Design a protein around this ligand. Structure first.
Ligand SMILES: Nc1ncnc2c1ncn2[C@@H]1O[C@H](COP(=O)(O)OP(=O)(O)O)[C@@H](O)[C@H]1O
Lengths: 481, 481
């Protein structure tokens, strides 16, 4: 039953995207906050699809009412909630579900005071007796930012999601967007994908029952302590941490999961900043946290580097056991041609060890790697050979010659000998530590290879999380060759 | 059938012009917006007849209702849409077609909030259920301009056409305007030029079916990115780009065309600016765009350079046939002055070839161009000469001296000689590639000589487009001499 819920949500948000290109993040975040009882805020220039998203999410329900209002500097509370006779609230806000308030940073003093009571209590001071407000989604958009010392900051600190919308930049997505024929006032949502009023009241209780894994708490508490030490980092109140969990628990609820997923921390990039200065700071700390401490990205880099350094140190010590013998070949040719090892070596960019280290190019080296396509030509036609040092840099020229006992002597600027050799086919101490680190990478990759189908995750984040996991796997499989 | 539609529209706008002088540009823009479902804004001092054009476009239909209301500082929404009893909207706005609202920049906050929902959704609330509004033309005149940080900018950013009206300036037009015997309250439009209600509903669906050519999309995306890089350029929202396509597609629909024509971009000069400061900036960027990349004006300039670069490559190979003999000018001077060829060369930025190429400024060169105004000064007064390389970059300094054989030796960093030469007075490969580019100019000129009969295009723009096409054609005919 929980597995079939992720399929119904994927089909509901698909019809909402039809008509607004490059706006999937501004629609999927509003649908999750509407089904969980959270708010959302938008910011940007007027004309980047900020009022249509408030009139589009109402079609996904069966008993929703829209309310598009524009707050002015001379607005009165009697024109927002309804004029009194006790207040005629026929189709306004106390009985509505999805309301829209544009330019909220300029309303009257009594208007903002009544909006704070309808959020923490979902009630209203309608005359004498109070009544509940079935508000499911609270969206607000504007253009500029409020003052640093004013009463408008009380509502900004209470809103959870802070969406950062902007104009389009891609050229391919602007072709069909410029000449679109889809109407924005029809009903693109089918009647089979709209939830009922009974399912909404039941889902509000099962969100709080999501367990909190111990591995997830290690990432939430670490991000809180990191922002406290940075002076340029914005301050986050205790209310924001409690309201953010309800958003992450609701994301895993509609994705076929029962616990808080570690990948759900990506949505925290729109719930910590407050201005344009802290926008690039929150997205930078999360990108390092998700690619450094989430699936133990940096935790394995500091462990694999010690294994490779220990492996290369043991290979340059036991080089006297395995040498390098070059076999001859028949045929009729002037220059004495040489043939490499047959099935013993098959790689193209193999590495060659050495006994006594030398100072080549005014620097030390512990291993020299050659090219298989370039080694076969020098051993047959002759000439000069080019090879890099320490696996980095360009293929510099070396003074490599042939030995009387069929070896590879490397000469330097002091006419010193250095017989090359190939590494044998892994010590027991290195293999014991390599299998334990490789098994930990498969366990972390198994968790990511099951929760990546989350609909509430942007597409640009999958290009960096997967690239950070494949980079470690491509390096750990090279030392075991 | 589509060809006969342009003749009926030309006769409809001609009857509406009778009675108003120097107002042809305002009537043509309001007629196209009325048949496409757009809006229009006027601005001017009281007395230039701003409310007469609203009562004039209603005679072009058969079932149209007028509404002329004066918005004041104490206006109420009940006196505009209709007083409630459920609202008595008998002949007002929810059931009207062409409405007029003068001095819209002073209404109450409840009036502006109801006008925003009657444009995007074409509906209006009536207590419980709602109803559609058969609005065909939205016009509103004023006198002053709104504030920079106010709530009145929400409606201004949604309007498309921004007309700039002014008092009369011509003396001949003012004499016949005061003594005009034509009545402004009669029906000058014949019964044969009035469209029916069935033809209007069918035309609103065929406008969205106009195809968007690939060459037209290159002009819209380039103009969008050009205004973003200029700080003084006004910001254009994404809503303005989408609403502008409906205006351009409607212009080509009533002109005998089935696709979007590049000449229709001239109407964008009154749909981007917002004040008197940005009025001269929008008309300047479009004038360069319509005379640069519209009919491939500059597009053939960057392609002709590749032919000249290939032509100069073959001329420098056979430069040993015709050298460059410099004659000695008459008069006894201290330094041996030199003089170029007389009538044989008259260009200001002529090019000079060379035999053996040299590595000047760490790069190769095949032709060096010198300025005629700067060559006569260096060869007569001495000093240092400055010349660019490959026709690009800045005029760098070169080590040019005089030769004993009356030539020009170019010295470099290795003290190497190089005798310069000039191209003489056409290969088969260059002629084949030149006829392909020259044929493209005739194809672009044939398109302009067929769609210039558009009535919605002003006459002053045709004087600069033809002058820009002849400049490109006059340059391509010079290399073939
Ligand atoms: N980025 C966008 N992609 C697709 N459509 C857009 C975009 N921005 C605006 N629109 C279209 O413009 C219309 C009006 O948008 P509007 O409500 O004025 O936006 P805002 O509320 O941000 O000013 C909408 O119907 C929407 O379809």
């Amino acid at each position: 039953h929980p597995h079939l819920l992720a399929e119904r949500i994927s089909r509901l948000s698909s019809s909402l995207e039809k008509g607004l290109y490059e706006r999937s993040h501004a629609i999927r975040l509003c649908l999750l906050a509407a089904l969980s009882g959270e708010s959302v805020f938008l910011l940007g220039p007027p004309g980047i699809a900020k009022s249509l998203i408030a009139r589009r999410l109402k079609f996904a329900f069966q008993n929703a009412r829209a309310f598009e209002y524009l707050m002015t500097r001379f607005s009165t509370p009697e024109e927002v909630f309804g004029p009194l006779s006790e207040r005629l609230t026929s189709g306004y806000l106390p009985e509505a579900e999805i309301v829209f308030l544009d330019e909220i940073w300029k309303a009257g003093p009594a208007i903002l005071n009544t909006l704070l009571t309808a959020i923490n209590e979902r009630q209203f001071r309608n005359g004498a007796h109070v009544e509940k407000i079935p508000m499911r989604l609270l969206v607000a958009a504007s253009n500029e930012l409020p003052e640093a010392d004013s009463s408008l900051e009380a509502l900004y600190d209470r809103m959870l999601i802070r969406l950062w919308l902007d104009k389009v930049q891609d050229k391919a997505n602007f072709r069909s967007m410029l000449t679109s024929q889809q109407d924005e006032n029809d009903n693109p949502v089918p009647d089979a994908l709209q939830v009922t009023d009974e399912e909404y009241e039941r889902w509000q209780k099962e969100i709080g029952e999501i367990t909190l894994p111990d591995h997830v708490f290690e990432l939430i508490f670490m991000l809180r302590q990191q922002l406290d030490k940075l002076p340029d980092a914005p301050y986050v109140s205790d209310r924001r941490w409690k309201k953010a969990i309800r958003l992450l628990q609701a994301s895993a609820f509609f994705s076929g999961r029962s616990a808080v997923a570690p990948v759900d921390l990506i949505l925290l990039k729109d719930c910590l900043w407050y201005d344009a200065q802290s926008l690039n700071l929150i997205q930078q700390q999360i990108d390092v946290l998700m690619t450094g401490h989430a699936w133990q990205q940096q935790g394995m880099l500091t462990r694999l580097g010690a294994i490779v350094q220990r492996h290369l140190q043991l290979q340059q010590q036991q080089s006297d056991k395995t040498a390098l013998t070059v076999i001859r070949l028949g045929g009729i040719f002037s220059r004495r041609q040489q043939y490499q090892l047959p099935v013993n070596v098959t790689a193209s960019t193999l590495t060659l060890l050495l006994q006594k280290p030398l100072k080549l190019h005014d620097m030390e080296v512990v291993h020299i790697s050659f090219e298989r396509s370039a080694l076969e030509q020098w051993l047959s036609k002759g000439g000069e050979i080019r090879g890099k040092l320490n696996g980095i840099g360009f293929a510099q020229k070396l003074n490599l010659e042939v030995d009387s006992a069929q070896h590879l002597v490397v000469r330097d600027v002091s006419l010193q000998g250095s017989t090359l050799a190939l590494p044998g086919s892994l010590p027991g101490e290195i293999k014991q530590q390599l299998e334990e680190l490789e098994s930990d990478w498969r366990k972390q990759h198994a968790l990511f290879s099951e929760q990546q189908k989350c609909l509430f995750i942007p597409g640009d984040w999958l290009g960096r999380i997967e690239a950070s996991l494949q980079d470690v796997g491509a390096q750990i499989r090279q030392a075991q060759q």
